[model samples]
Target: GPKVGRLIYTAGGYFRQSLSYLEAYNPSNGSWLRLADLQVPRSGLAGCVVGGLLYAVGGRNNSPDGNTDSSALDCYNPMTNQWSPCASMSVPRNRIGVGVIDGHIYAVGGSHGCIHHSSVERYEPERDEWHLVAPMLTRRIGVGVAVLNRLLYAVGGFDGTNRLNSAECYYPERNEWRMITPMNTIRSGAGVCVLHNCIYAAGGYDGQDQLNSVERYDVETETWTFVAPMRHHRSALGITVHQGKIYVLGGYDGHTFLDSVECYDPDSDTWSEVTRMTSGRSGVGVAVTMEPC
Candidate 1:
């Protein structure tokens, strides 16, 4: 329904590719306008912007239990308002963590069936191929991935047994993963991004309940601390920094789906409720638009 069109705004592009249903939001007007559809319909897909083009990575389609065997890749060119096929990922992944570094998209750990995955893949758009890279220390599904200082951060995710509070980073120059300061609480399905030279991770399931707590990671000090939380609990939501502010949108709150959007002002140190989306959804992806065509 409105799910596909609503979840396309990622800051750097990452996650699932859905077929042909797309829309663009007007920040100035706080409205949505329909645009071109993707080549396929897949949520939990990773997306990122490379060379100003939107790229959608692996995600499950409408198969049983949300289509787990999807390894599709599609690129969207906003100037032309069209989406075209790109080379597919080497392995199929659902709710895979994704980040872009030095113009390459990194596909982090995700699960299939009872098998949690620690494998990672790096995508080179120029060559149109995926190459295996250093895997994470632990298997992660529904991981929160973000890029800061040109490094890829893979945050909290569910292992086969426990929800994680651990975090690791990938150094592209060395092509390796190293442990980082862990978060205070266990969380899976959190949204992470960097702002004001620090990483911010928001609402997620804390292994027991849907969480509304937010935390900040200081890169300089290598420490994690708490911050003002959003108005409601959100897991697997769409979060991106736009114009010096953090914008988070639709995701599940354990009890029900949410279409509500919230904005956080770093200067103000608080979250401000904004307009709601067309409909609510969960496990969604988002990317910010760049120069078209």
Candidate 2:
């Protein structure tokens, strides 16, 4: 089970000519842990935990690589400490938004060679394959995604020209998508999570600036409400909820990479500093789960 205060992060740092993964310290205990290095060095990837396994998908090794996004769906099992390659997606895209619904993983909009797209795909673990899903209304990259009230919401992201404030939700039962309330501010590369059936959007970039603002959307009211702003602006960040507390991990702060981490408690509507990772990085995937095989 997840404890009250602990930090677990994955960072992809730039070295002389290579990249690596490092687990950060707890700060409370002052210890370091190591994670399995990615088979291929990549950035701008998105991930989620399903049935106690971490799946890494859709990213590139370099910034300007047009066809860099790999369709590979790599599954990591912590219990066995190994990674197994599964069926890949139909399209190759980067900075995509992902969510697991009813045993199927959805990969939302992303960029296809500098061009933003509304492409979407769903992965079936049982068949080890991916199938096309209902596309989002807007073509975007760096979008934030969360499943709330049995609906999939794709939040703010970029559209090649500027950041977006638009939002869309997909009802699995209907197999369709509908536009929802736009975000309070336009942003991309942000972090998002579901808490108590509400969608929480965190820090990201907004064209000319990095954002520390936070907001939440109510499914019942279809309205956006302000929440606790982060201490620092972060884009290309990872967000996850463990033990009822939302955790924000390493990302870009506009000018440079970051290793700082923090936690948000909805009860107090506050953001508190958590442990920091050893290396600085931006654009990594995160997976957190309490189940074990």
Candidate 3:
């Protein structure tokens, strides 16, 4: 049996990560205790939990006049409470989507400025290397990735020209990507996660406006369906599945940054505002990791 305590680790965001801010949510008492800062401050990065440690992958330093894109990877050890740099990726990137499978972190399609990419990278922690893998069919930035049913799904990202409604998944064994039924709305920075065997792609820019819309993909049927929309529109939100519920954190809502948090209960088919972060953060990264009591 697995241990009970799990914390939702949130890091970096638009304008907020400038402080190198990192925080973790404790469900036991609904407290958010401040954690350590990232070694290299970044936004538009990807995060995942593997083997009891947190991994922060490639993201750019949002500077007015410094090197923007990054290929560095950082590992956080809770026991010792510090971050250590690992092997960096060959190709620099930001706004990439990431997922963990077979104890490897697969960095999906992302871009460096106007140089959008279809290329992908897989980070093997034990091997301590970021290896190039098969690329996606479409060039994407600000993509939403979720690993479900052993397949990593990449959905609705800006493809240089348009905010797309397209979606695809990669099979690690085959080292290839396959297209899936696209979502209804064209989204560029949706918060995506898998829960109860379904993938929920929620709230992002639909090109015209920051979206409050939400939709679920039925993996077995290969179709997308609408769900209850969020109270606030959002893009680049921090989201993850925890204890049978989906938690969506701060994100941009077209005009303003949001500090509000919402929880979607699949059993009730409703979304309710639950908490808030100390600061507003769009383009934030979040991952759930459990700890033994």
Candidate 4:
């Protein structure tokens, strides 16, 4: 039996090969267990939790150079411990943005095959269909997206040519997106999360180099402020919040895959190292749930 604590799952990433592997970490006892493998091995996928179930969305089946993007939707149920195929997206995409709000999953800008896209799609689990919504104003991939205050925020990402420092938010009522104050640093593959009424964007690549810096967005001020940097430079990391702390998981540091894990304390504005993962990885998917494993 496992102790009750926040359950964090990280699945899929690139190393020597694209991996479909899944594993769960128990914060209570600092233990980890390997879970079911993904239906297919892929990297750069988007994942989110909806109605207590986990869904793995768009990703590429091969490395970045392969152009084998995927739109496959694989659903995971922890209660039954199984995986099943679901309806795919309207277009194949990888390095995409995904978030859930009001029982619907939104798939935002990402690359489809060799092209970057500005398309946006929503998935209704009940209907088992995807519907297109207002597209983003900019074409991008490696974007970091998060849901906060009933709105979806699209953070910096790479356009086909340049790394971006721009940011925008989607208003569902009007089905329109408007620009917000951009991040301090150009970042793609960064991990974003909202906590205590502020949005935080962590380590990512800046086109020329991997970054260890972090930034905070204050909703009240509509401006971003620099914050404590991560202990390691990282890009394509998986991030989640639990028990009032933000956890930043594995990613690439330019030279090697990373298994190092770290946590940030918003109260102190500081970061502290935690237990490492079983193996190094990048472009991994992570999510936290109240239900313990």
Candidate 5:
């Protein structure tokens, strides 16, 4: 019996095949453990933790027959080892951005089939319902999103034809969205997280190729600066911060799905490889929380 931090990875894809695989990593031992499968097989979904429970939002579901977009909302409780459906989103989407603030989960822009979306919705776990919020200024898919300083930041993503370098911040207090200074590189499917009061964006696809470049946005100075990049060029990965370091998990590398893992230390400005995942995955969803026992 050990009380250690845990990183949880949920459903994703390998090419056109979607997976319901769920697993967890222990930084303490650098090991992974299989968890319960998702009720529905999907990929490109967004997940977040609130009040010790995991909430999985919109994504695309692909089976042997065909692919379909979903608005399904599922919650997983580690204590009971169970998954249950909640209120579905009004919009069926995939490759979206999600964050938790003030006990509410915010689902941002994603794609419905090949069509990009600008819609934003907020979910109330207590009421088990979703409500419309201020939509993003740009229609985006595969964007990076995180909550820092009580504001939600939506980073680089694909706006249909082009990979975007633009960024935006949402202030729930005013119910508004404001476009902010863009990242240095145009990217999509990057993993973004807030660490040490800075917003760090990891590797992403730049339309032409996958990129290993990473950047950090200073909340105080309101500027973006280059940081140590990851060992692999990953897009549609999972990221979370634990013990002051940023962990970037599995994603795609344009040519193949990836199971590699790496972490960035803000203090030393360095990136180091960690234990690889059990299986290759793209469009993975991740959340970090205290050991659930």
Candidate 6:
């Protein structure tokens, strides 16, 4: 979803020569209008935009051994629609979640089976460097990040063994983590969004099943409520409220890959189908569009 002046740039779930990006226009009428692809292929990565530049971080890359490997942190300029490598994360991560606050971008947890992460690091665009921050209180993998009221909230995800019911808030000022109300259902890999101070968590897996259930958290009240369910249960999809409309894009449903995209109009509480991505994939990442400053 394009916002203000930038375009929506997300990691195109890479599966070989197919690595790329997916861009949707501001308030796309009924479809995600794709743009030029990314300069590289990456999967299980995370991305965010600050000022006019988009940052894409760690994910598994192809290896000669035919096993997944981690990639370096990279930056992109939507103005030119080109990518260049930047500072690398101290720890390699995939299926990672990222958030940007106060001009800094933070990479949260991810994993490779037993090697889970609870660490967090802030990337400074000015110095092109990454500095360690407070580690999350609990170890987690496959999560989502959203900023609300000057604080970063780390939402639903797995913790190695099972779906997790926990949620935590990162207060940058104090650099600490405090537990918040757990989600109504245990899940991971859900698409999360914050609109008008309310947080929307939608379409993730619940261990045994993929989910279409959508959950809402009111920042002011610290409470949760159930919203409309999506037409499909998807994890690793992209979700954001652009110009007041919520767009949901590609994700995996356990059994199959999907390119299906959907949008929700809060004014009517309705969802409409949209055009599919050129390729179907899961474990992708999305960032709010921001033209280069």
Best by TM-score: 3
Can you give the lDDT of residue 280 in candidate 4? 94
On TM-score, the stronger of 2 and 5 is 5
Highest lDDT scorer: 4
RMSD of candidate 3 to the true fold? 1.6
Candidate 3 lDDT: 0.85
Clashes of 6: 3
Report the lDDT tens digits of candidate 2 across residue range 1-293. Answer: 54534445453433222244634344347566676777876676777767767788777666333336666688877676567888988877778889989878999888768778798889989888899978888888999999976689999998888789999999888888999999888879889889886899898888778888988999999898989899989887878876667888877787767777888998999999877766667777776642222
Which digits, one per residue and each the tens of the lDDT, describe model 4 over residues 1-293? 43355588887887876789888888888888888899888888877888778888888877455547888888888877788898999998888888888989999888886689889999999999999999998887999988888899889998899889999999999999999999999999999888888888998899888999999888779999998999999999988887788899889998889998899998899999887999999988788653434
**How much is 52 displaced in model 1, in angstroms?**
1.3
RMSD after CA superposition, every candidate: 4.8, 2.9, 1.6, 2.4, 1.9, 2.8
lDDT at position 227, candidate 3: 90
What is the lDDT, from 0 to 100, of the residue 178 in candidate 1?
A: 96
In candidate 4 the C-alpha lDDT for residue 116 amounts to 92
* Candidate 2, lDDT over the whole model: 0.77
For model 5, name the residue pairs that clash: 189-236
Q: Each candidate: what lDDT?
A: 0.77, 0.77, 0.85, 0.86, 0.85, 0.76
* Sliding window of 10 residues with minimal summed lDDT for model 5: 2-11
TM-score of each: 0.90, 0.90, 0.96, 0.95, 0.95, 0.90
Error of 2 at 194 (Å): 1.1
1-293: candidate 1 lDDT, tens digit per residue: 12222233632112232233455565666777666666566667666778768877776665344545457778888779778888877778877888988889998887766778899998898899899999999999888899999998989999889999999989888988999999997889888888888888999889788888999888889999998989999888878777778888777787777878899999978998887766666665677765343
Clashes of each: 25, 0, 0, 0, 1, 3
Residue-level lDDT of model 3, residues 1-293, one tens digit each, is 67578888887777634436778887667788778888777888878899998888777887666747878788887776688999988777788898888898988878887888889988888889888999999998889999887899999998889999999989888989989998999999899899988899999899889888999999999999989999999998888888899999988987778998899999889999888898887777788775322
Off by over 4 Å in 4: 1-4, 63-67, 290-293
Backbone clash pairs for candidate 2 read none
- Supply candidate 6's per-residue lDDT for 286: 76
The weakest ten consecutive residues by lDDT in model 2 span: 11-20
